Design a protein around this nucleic acid. Structure first.
Ligand SMILES: [Zn+2]
Ligand SMILES: [Zn+2]
Ligand SMILES: [Zn+2]
Ligand SMILES: [Zn+2]
Ligand SMILES: [Zn+2]
Length: 143
DNA sequence: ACGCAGGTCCTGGACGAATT
DNA sequence: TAATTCGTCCAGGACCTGCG
Protein backbone atom coordinates (compact mmCIF):
# COMPACT_ATOMS: atom_id res chain seq x y z
CA UNK A 1 0.00 0.00 0.00
CA UNK A 2 1.09 0.91 -2.40
CA UNK A 3 3.05 -1.94 -4.01
CA UNK A 4 4.27 -1.75 -7.61
CA UNK A 5 6.79 -4.64 -7.81
CA UNK A 6 5.41 -8.09 -8.64
CA UNK A 7 7.00 -11.53 -8.86
CA UNK A 8 6.50 -12.99 -12.34
CA UNK A 9 6.46 -16.52 -10.86
CA UNK A 10 3.91 -16.35 -8.01
CA UNK A 11 2.40 -12.86 -8.45
CA UNK A 12 3.13 -11.55 -4.95
CA UNK A 13 3.48 -7.79 -4.49
CA UNK A 14 6.30 -5.77 -2.94
CA UNK A 15 6.86 -2.09 -2.21
CA UNK A 16 10.61 -2.07 -2.97
CA UNK A 17 12.60 -3.82 -5.68
CA UNK A 18 15.01 -4.98 -2.97
CA UNK A 19 12.13 -6.88 -1.36
CA UNK A 20 11.16 -8.51 -4.66
CA UNK A 21 14.79 -9.47 -5.32
CA UNK A 22 15.03 -11.10 -1.90
CA UNK A 23 11.78 -13.02 -2.40
CA UNK A 24 12.70 -14.22 -5.91
CA UNK A 25 15.32 -16.53 -4.35
CA UNK A 26 12.66 -19.06 -3.32
CA UNK A 27 12.04 -19.68 -7.04
CA UNK A 28 15.62 -19.65 -8.37
CA UNK A 29 17.43 -21.09 -5.34
CA UNK A 30 20.11 -18.41 -5.70
CA UNK A 31 21.59 -17.48 -2.30
CA UNK A 32 19.11 -19.62 -0.36
CA UNK A 33 20.60 -21.16 2.83
CA UNK A 34 22.99 -23.91 1.70
CA UNK A 35 23.83 -27.05 3.67
CA UNK A 36 27.59 -27.40 4.07
CA UNK A 37 27.34 -31.21 3.79
CA UNK A 38 25.14 -31.83 0.73
CA UNK A 39 24.92 -28.25 -0.66
CA UNK A 40 21.15 -28.40 -1.04
CA UNK A 41 19.25 -25.18 -0.38
CA UNK A 42 16.41 -24.43 2.02
CA UNK A 43 13.84 -21.72 2.52
CA UNK A 44 15.19 -20.27 5.77
CA UNK A 45 18.01 -21.17 8.13
CA UNK A 46 15.61 -23.00 10.45
CA UNK A 47 14.69 -25.43 7.67
CA UNK A 48 18.40 -25.84 6.95
CA UNK A 49 19.08 -26.63 10.61
CA UNK A 50 16.24 -29.16 10.54
CA UNK A 51 17.76 -30.79 7.46
CA UNK A 52 21.20 -30.96 9.11
CA UNK A 53 19.93 -33.78 11.33
CA UNK A 54 19.43 -35.99 8.27
CA UNK A 55 23.24 -36.14 8.11
CA UNK A 56 23.95 -36.62 11.84
CA UNK A 57 21.23 -39.11 12.74
CA UNK A 58 20.17 -37.02 15.73
CA UNK A 59 16.65 -37.90 16.94
CA UNK A 60 15.95 -35.35 19.69
CA UNK A 61 12.23 -36.06 20.29
CA UNK A 62 11.81 -39.10 22.55
CA UNK A 63 8.57 -40.91 23.37
CA UNK A 64 8.24 -41.06 27.16
CA UNK A 65 6.04 -44.18 26.84
CA UNK A 66 8.30 -46.55 24.88
CA UNK A 67 11.63 -44.69 24.67
CA UNK A 68 11.86 -44.53 20.88
CA UNK A 69 13.20 -41.28 19.42
CA UNK A 70 12.14 -39.33 16.33
CA UNK A 71 13.71 -36.71 14.08
CA UNK A 72 10.74 -34.31 14.38
CA UNK A 73 8.25 -33.38 17.09
CA UNK A 74 5.39 -33.80 14.60
CA UNK A 75 6.50 -37.41 14.08
CA UNK A 76 6.56 -38.00 17.83
CA UNK A 77 3.08 -36.49 18.15
CA UNK A 78 1.81 -38.79 15.40
CA UNK A 79 3.54 -41.74 17.07
CA UNK A 80 1.98 -41.11 20.49
CA UNK A 81 -1.49 -41.44 18.96
CA UNK A 82 -0.58 -45.10 18.34
CA UNK A 83 -0.08 -45.74 22.07
CA UNK A 84 -3.37 -44.01 22.89
CA UNK A 85 -5.48 -45.62 20.16
CA UNK A 86 -6.33 -42.17 18.80
CA UNK A 87 -7.55 -42.44 15.19
CA UNK A 88 -8.98 -39.02 14.27
CA UNK A 89 -8.56 -39.49 10.48
CA UNK A 90 -11.37 -41.40 8.78
CA UNK A 91 -12.20 -42.19 5.18
CA UNK A 92 -15.55 -40.53 4.47
CA UNK A 93 -16.25 -43.18 1.83
CA UNK A 94 -15.80 -46.46 3.71
CA UNK A 95 -15.37 -45.29 7.32
CA UNK A 96 -11.92 -46.79 7.88
CA UNK A 97 -10.01 -44.84 10.54
CA UNK A 98 -6.31 -44.17 11.06
CA UNK A 99 -4.00 -42.57 13.60
CA UNK A 100 -1.67 -41.51 10.76
CA UNK A 101 -2.85 -38.73 8.44
CA UNK A 102 -0.79 -39.99 5.51
CA UNK A 103 -2.11 -43.54 5.84
CA UNK A 104 -5.60 -42.07 5.59
CA UNK A 105 -4.78 -39.90 2.57
CA UNK A 106 -3.04 -42.81 0.84
CA UNK A 107 -5.99 -45.11 1.51
CA UNK A 108 -8.51 -42.68 0.02
CA UNK A 109 -6.79 -42.88 -3.39
CA UNK A 110 -7.94 -46.50 -3.68
CA UNK A 111 -11.54 -45.32 -4.08
CA UNK A 112 -10.50 -43.56 -7.31
CA UNK A 113 -9.28 -46.76 -8.97
CA UNK A 114 -6.31 -44.91 -10.48
CA UNK A 115 -3.25 -47.12 -11.09
CA UNK A 116 -0.66 -44.83 -12.70
CA UNK A 117 2.43 -47.03 -12.12
CA UNK A 118 2.92 -49.59 -14.91
CA UNK A 119 5.58 -52.32 -14.83
CA UNK A 120 7.90 -51.71 -17.82
CA UNK A 121 8.52 -55.46 -18.12
CA UNK A 122 4.98 -56.90 -18.07
CA UNK A 123 2.55 -53.96 -17.94
CA UNK A 124 0.90 -54.80 -14.62
CA UNK A 125 -0.47 -51.56 -13.15
CA UNK A 126 -0.28 -50.49 -9.51
CA UNK A 127 -1.89 -47.76 -7.43
CA UNK A 128 1.28 -47.59 -5.32
CA UNK A 129 4.82 -46.99 -6.54
CA UNK A 130 5.77 -49.10 -3.50
CA UNK A 131 4.09 -52.19 -4.92
CA UNK A 132 5.70 -51.64 -8.34
CA UNK A 133 9.20 -51.44 -6.82
CA UNK A 134 8.64 -54.71 -4.96
CA UNK A 135 7.08 -56.25 -8.08
CA UNK A 136 10.13 -55.43 -10.20
CA UNK A 137 12.35 -57.30 -7.75
CA UNK A 138 10.56 -60.47 -8.86
CA UNK A 139 11.61 -59.84 -12.46
CA UNK A 140 15.22 -59.43 -11.30
CA UNK A 141 15.20 -62.60 -9.18
CA UNK A 142 13.76 -64.33 -12.26
CA UNK A 143 16.74 -63.18 -14.35
C1' DA B 1 2.91 -66.73 -4.70
C1' DC B 2 2.58 -62.14 -4.56
C1' DG B 3 -0.55 -58.42 -5.17
C1' DC B 4 -2.36 -55.59 -1.94
C1' DA B 5 -2.70 -52.31 1.54
C1' DG B 6 -2.06 -50.84 6.22
C1' DG B 7 1.84 -49.68 9.88
C1' DT B 8 5.33 -46.64 10.74
C1' DC B 9 8.50 -42.81 10.68
C1' DC B 10 11.43 -39.80 7.69
C1' DT B 11 11.72 -35.40 4.86
C1' DG B 12 10.83 -30.79 3.69
C1' DG B 13 7.64 -27.31 1.53
C1' DA B 14 3.96 -24.08 3.37
C1' DC B 15 2.59 -20.59 6.32
C1' DG B 16 1.53 -18.06 10.41
C1' DA B 17 3.91 -17.16 15.01
C1' DA B 18 7.76 -15.63 17.52
C1' DT B 19 11.99 -13.41 17.66
C1' DT B 20 15.50 -10.12 16.35
C1' DT C 1 7.42 -2.07 11.69
C1' DA C 2 10.18 -5.19 8.68
C1' DA C 3 13.16 -9.10 8.20
C1' DT C 4 14.63 -13.12 9.93
C1' DT C 5 14.07 -17.30 12.29
C1' DC C 6 11.03 -20.64 14.47
C1' DG C 7 7.37 -24.03 15.28
C1' DT C 8 4.13 -26.52 13.27
C1' DC C 9 1.08 -28.47 9.90
C1' DC C 10 0.63 -31.30 6.39
C1' DA C 11 1.72 -33.64 1.87
C1' DG C 12 4.50 -37.01 0.08
C1' DG C 13 7.44 -40.78 0.39
C1' DA C 14 10.46 -45.17 1.74
C1' DC C 15 10.74 -49.29 4.00
C1' DC C 16 8.36 -52.76 6.68
C1' DT C 17 4.76 -56.28 7.58
C1' DG C 18 1.08 -59.59 7.21
C1' DC C 19 -3.17 -60.97 5.02
C1' DG C 20 -6.11 -63.30 1.44
ZN1 LIG D 1 7.37 -15.30 -6.23
ZN1 LIG E 1 22.59 -31.43 3.66
ZN1 LIG F 1 6.35 -44.64 21.94
ZN1 LIG G 1 -12.11 -45.75 2.37
ZN1 LIG H 1 6.08 -56.85 -14.23
Amino acid sequence: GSKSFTCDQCGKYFSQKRQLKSHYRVHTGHSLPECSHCHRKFMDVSQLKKHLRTHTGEKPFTCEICGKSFTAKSSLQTHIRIHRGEKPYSCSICGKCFSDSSAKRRHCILHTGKKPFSCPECGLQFARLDNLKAHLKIHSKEK
